[model samples]
Target: YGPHADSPVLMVYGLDQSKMNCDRVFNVFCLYGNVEKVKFMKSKPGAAMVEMADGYAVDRAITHLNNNFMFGQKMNVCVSKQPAIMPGQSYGLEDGSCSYKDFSESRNNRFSTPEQAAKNRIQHPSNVLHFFNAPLEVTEENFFEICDELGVKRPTSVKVFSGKSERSSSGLLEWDSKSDALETLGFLNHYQMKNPNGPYPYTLKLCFSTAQHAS
Candidate 1:
């Protein structure tokens, strides 16, 4: 919202305009912070304005995701001179969605959360995802179900963390390379997993884990 102080929202160009959208942007950027808004530019077809929860949020995203490849485009993610994305007259994306969209009204955004901010500094994935906020009794099959449906590679292995109870659904899901790991994150983060008893379902969140231990 006005970048608060320094006013440093990110401007990302060199994108696959035909493939990337607001949701896709959020899926990746949200790993670093609470992604507030992402808008496809009408003036710049392959450019975008990404608004995140805070100033450091934008900084961390730029440090991590800038220059990364997406849908065959080497992204050029940099801080924008414009403070925030003011939704004005907009056009439509090739994917049939409007260029200007609001994504602030969602769970797990704003109010500087713990853990997620720390992982934002993880410059690159070591080819593993520390998946958390899952069901208490999660097994290998549960993860495979999502992977199979998403058509991403099945996890090479699932190492469940010790001590299972409430807020105890953390595990390590290792993958082949950064390629599929990023793709899996692209498809699986913030996924809603139904609860066995609770009224509210669980939100599966993914963050890069440096641990690569295996048998």
Candidate 2:
């Protein structure tokens, strides 16, 4: 029998544990022993319960991690004999049945709407660019010129924003495809844009326009 069957359960409190999340705490405690399960107790804020395969593992984890700093927050660890149970399920009351809802949703073929999927596609925009210090006087003409000189393809569109009096700081070069954007971003994010004779060095930002703004 695993120690957890009779192992003393521990309650940890007051660490904004929810915000800290289960992954971080589990990573630390699992080192002591096989952690059977780690749960963030919903009844209490900033609380979590960790169950190890054995009681000895629990004791060791408590000893080592009781007051340790996890994600910059100190935690409380104590032994409890009370069996932890999910509130609504154990009492058989009006529990929010996400499990049932999920099953039903699945039956109905409820899935990510087209809009949600598109939003995800936007947030993870495949194309990216790296740009650094650019001259303020730089225009689309100059931007294309630099790319041409570097043997990089001219971007589908160029947008430049104003910078300091003589030095420009921000702009984006949009490419026709994500691959093109990512390729350009990789090479030019930090590469020098202008010759040493130029008044200011050149750098460019490469990125996709917002999904909503894309054609």
Candidate 3:
């Protein structure tokens, strides 16, 4: 987390080829720290490179993602010998999307601001997730609709924090299984909600909560 020269490169293996992409992986990694870049290699079909903002973020990623299951496959996260992922003759994925992506300037990066970083409560992958920066009049069904839209299982319990502020909404969502929650994190973190104003959309943020239950 502190400034050091540790490499931020982490090679990911065993991804769900059918569904894996830069965006989905970005969702999962951004929860721990900022994701600077994600690149899928044609030379390595089942493996890809993720460049996090710093070495601390890379450590956080491996701690939570190594040997994790996703789409019926066990994923691997390990430090790479390369200092960074360099560009090459990139190609399309199974879905015809770009093999490489750079998110260095993305506004959805949660750790970009000091206050934003402080509010983020990181924990081990859990069945419960804490959410914030939602619409003011958010409700449980709103989240259920999101799960439905994402084609993921809905959380068993949803607690919307009240009067927290008109600035943004904060809440907790709990699922019966950590696997489902993990999958949801990949699909739903930094999800863009409908913004009442025209300037920008509300970027919903999610993190693994320390609380075991939604209570």
Which model scores highest in lDDT?
3
Candidate 2 accuracy as TM-score: 0.36
How far residue 209's Cα lies from its native spot in candidate 2, in Å, is 46
lDDT of 3 at 3: 36
lDDT of each: 0.75, 0.48, 0.84
Model 1 — which ten-residue stretch has the worst lDDT?
116-125
Q: Name model 1 segments beyond 4 Å from true.
A: 1-6, 14-19, 92-97, 110-123, 213-215
78 in model 3: Cα distance from truth in Å? Answer: 0.6
Which is the winner by lDDT between candidate 1 and candidate 2?
Answer: 1
Which candidate should be chosen as best, given TM-score against the real structure?
3
Over 1-215, each residue of candidate 1 has an lDDT whose tens digit, in order, gives 44433554788898677656787667777776777788888778789888876787777777777777655567787888888889887887777888877778867553355754554545455578887788888888998997887677888988888763456488888877776677677668777887897888788878788787422
Worst 10 residues of 3 by lDDT: 1-10
The digit string of per-residue lDDT tens for model 3 on 1-215 reads 37343688889998876777888889888887888889986767678889987888888889878888877778898887778877777787777778889999998787887787776666588889999888888889999998999898899999988864368898899998887888888889888988786677788988898888887
lDDT of 3: 0.84
Instruction: Sort the predicted structures by lDDT, highest score first.
Output: 3, 1, 2
RMSD of every candidate to native, in Å, equals 3.5, 20.5, 2.2
Q: Give the 10-residue window scoring lowest on summed lDDT in candidate 2.
A: 99-108
